[PDB]
Amino acid sequence: IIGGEFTTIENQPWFAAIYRRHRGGSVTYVCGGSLISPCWVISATHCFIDYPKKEDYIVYLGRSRLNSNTQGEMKFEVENLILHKDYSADTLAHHNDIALLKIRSKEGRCAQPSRTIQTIALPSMYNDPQFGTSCEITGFGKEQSTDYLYPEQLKMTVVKLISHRECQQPHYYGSEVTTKMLCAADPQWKTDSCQGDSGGPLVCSLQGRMTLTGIVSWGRGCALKDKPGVYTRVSHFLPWIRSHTKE
């Protein structure tokens, strides 16, 4: 997250921190995700496509820090890693960038809700906030495009939804953005998602309900003029989500 503010997991208790174990034993951060039911985390396919083996991954819930344990956290293996079969790496602008992780602890259990671990509601189909609506994004991604390190503390910021009409302009993203995607940016371009934020939640309040409107997917650089962050439009994937969460 470029700009924005530090936070702790209490302020985004559905946030899932996803890591990969390397041959040699080293564990590195991969991407964010969101808990949508006790056994299911939703994220982005591009985070996993190069290493599709479920045994490679570790998922934490209730974690506020990147390389330190948070009191009360839960650790999970990935029982199933489900990538969207129509994924395409189309020059930055990934299509169908959505993935599901069925989580299971060493003891064979799913998530247990607490003050630091809670699910996020899915939207109604094709029901998204009006453009110009302020939404929030959360993650452990870079604080500056030029940084080498990721922040140790979780961050969040606010971005505004951008119409498909505005985002499809040639001076924005042209044909790279589809109706299954959502653009969001800051009016001053001063805050944004960045590398490492992929897979995490874009949350909007619709009708009083905090809703998983988007999943961090792609963008040209970070916090750059006329280059919004781009998000998978969750409300266009409900049948995919419902079928695969029975697996």
UniProtKB/Swiss-Prot annotation:
Active site: 46 (charge relay system), 97 (charge relay system), 198 (charge relay system)
Superkingdom: Eukaryota
Disulfide bonds: 31-47, 39-110, 135-204, 167-183, 194-222
Domain Peptidase S1, residue spans: 1-246
Modified residues (Phosphoserine): 145
Glycosylated position list: 144
Protein name per the record: Urokinase-type plasminogen activator chain B
Organism: Homo sapiens (Human)
Gene from which this protein is expressed: PLAU
Stretch of the intact protein here: 179 to 425 of 431
